[PDB]
Design a protein around this ligand. Sequence first.
Ligand SMILES: *[C@@]1(O[C@H]2[C@H](O)[C@H](O)[C@H](O)O[C@@H]2C(=O)O)O[C@H](C(=O)O)[C@@H](O[C@@H]2O[C@H](C(=O)O)[C@@H](O)[C@H](O)[C@@H]2O)[C@H](O)[C@@H]1O
Length: 226
Amino acid sequence: FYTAPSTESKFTEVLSKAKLQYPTSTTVAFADDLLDGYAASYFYLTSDLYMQFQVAGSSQRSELREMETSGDEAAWDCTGSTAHVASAQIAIPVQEDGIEEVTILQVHDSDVTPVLRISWVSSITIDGVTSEDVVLATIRNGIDDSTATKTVLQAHTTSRTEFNINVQNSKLSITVDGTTELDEADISQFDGSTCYFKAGAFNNNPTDTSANARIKMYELEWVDHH
Ligand SMILES: *[C@@]1(O[C@H]2[C@H](O)[C@H](O)[C@H](O)O[C@@H]2C(=O)O)O[C@H](C(=O)O)[C@@H](O[C@@H]2O[C@H](C(=O)O)[C@@H](O)[C@H](O)[C@@H]2O)[C@H](O)[C@@H]1O
């Protein structure tokens, strides 16, 4: 009985440029499936026109993965001269008890490393400073370095928030409601990698593997320029 996100033309283009993964990395719905009215408990359109992702379990996901309209997977040069831009209007609800971190946007390499995760976190400690209930940027220091650089972007609000990721020429910037919160972070450690965007709900390290992470997107698009 779930309404499909494809019924809203504001999502037609990104869905044509996406495939849906759930509850792990396996695709459950390709672009043509998504455009043909795909809907389920973990991926549906709310009555007020949010595309809502929901998932439970450790490291489980309901996530769109960037695709080309050709059906090729997106695999752009992570540090190339072409600008790649993802924009999303996201409402992060108060998360259920036991939900501790939810990744909502990513730049992922074509193998096994997230270049960037934007995530909500219950708590984070960065160089001795503890922040509670914030939205975080995490940039991995390398493919062979499991550590990452972390930057608080925003105090969590239930309000619809505009996020923009701009990647170009080995730098990455993030704006939140129009304000730069990460200014040209270096990602040269992904020279020679290819990359793609992801958006949705990716549940990291829950303390209740039964609780549902839930994320709502009012707008979502990804583009490039030359
Ligand atoms: C890292 O995030 C991982 C996510 O949780 C998902 O599993 C994703 O699929 O892969 C991400 C990744 O590998 O980058 O998780 C590790 C971790 O949990 O061990 C983080 O490494 C720790 O980070 C903290 C910190 O920087 O605050 C350190 O205190 C700790 O010693 C580890 O370095 C990593 O930063 C990243 O979040």
